[PDB]
Design a protein around this ligand. Sequence first.
Ligand code: CL
Length: 414
Amino acid sequence: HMEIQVLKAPRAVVWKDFLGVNAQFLWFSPERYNKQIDRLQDLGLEWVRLDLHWDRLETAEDQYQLASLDQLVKDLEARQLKSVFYLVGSARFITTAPFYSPFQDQYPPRDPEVFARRMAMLSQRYPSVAAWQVWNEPNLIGFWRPKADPEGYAKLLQASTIALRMVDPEKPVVSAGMAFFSEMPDGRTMFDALGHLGVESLGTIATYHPYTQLPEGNYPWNLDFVSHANQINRALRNAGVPAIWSTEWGWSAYKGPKELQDIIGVEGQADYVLRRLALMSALDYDRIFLFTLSDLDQRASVRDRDYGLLDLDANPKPVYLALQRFLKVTGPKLRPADPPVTEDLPDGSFSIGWTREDGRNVWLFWSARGGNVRLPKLKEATLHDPLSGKVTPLSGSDGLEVPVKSSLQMLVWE
Ligand SMILES: [Cl-]
């Protein structure tokens, strides 16, 4: 038996355009988040995604707390960043929460038009913002209590879209990032239910947050990330969405105790992020956003503290250094191509081909069982290991011997 997953991207990828990061800048002093941005810019990236919680911005009806946000928006433009902001949660005066609920903000608003007016206010206040995103993970109980409500979310999205387009009719409106592949507890998907409600007529950008245990799936015997992503992306294109983003994905380096995600540490984080990036950049996404730019302090849950590219001091973690090496090897723009001819590529291999700007080919590959592969048509190539930083010239009189790892390697060849 021999199963190999080959991917070829549907279009060229320009990293500056394609790969953004989530960030939590308001958790930090301006000095600290400007250093985070220094690091982001050093990767050649510019897109950021930022969360806004309504209950934190409007702490009582028409009592706002905007000084920090005002300054951040000025700072983002001064650093030439392109930003997408999402607004989520109900302010206390508008929530559908029962009086004695402990999670007041996790209920949707009583009146969608009130929420919509706030998104319009924010957009009008901050014209530099590139896109506005409406709520977050409404298929997940923790963001929309007491039960997922496609009809309710559609009305909220409709009302927000109309209001945002009144402020600026040309600016993109992004629907909420759906948790995972948009599955709801009742066994339907939010994307499907919204399709029945005619939501595609709104023309909003569709997005979801396909976290999985491993880079290619949830179990070693069921690596079906690619299959799921292709299926949902095809369905979205068929419904005529203007674009598909993935606004969250990634892994935490936390040490435990285990909560949903297996413990993999800083080296596992580097490994998994790189493999998933190789996959997603070759799938039908227009833009994706890694979670997240920086580690967070103890205001975050134990797991959520360690998703960063950067540690708390805004210094590179292993995943940053690995991603940096990766992007240096690819260069800033990749065009779709085929992998080289192989002999005895190991079962379970992933295999992705690109061409860079200087015309050299780039092959991305790995397999859970490791091993070795022969490339009969090549006499010279250069092998890159972005996790270790090792660079290895390969040569042969009539073909190359290439070691295969469980982690991503990059072969540059012509
Ligand atoms: Cl290049």
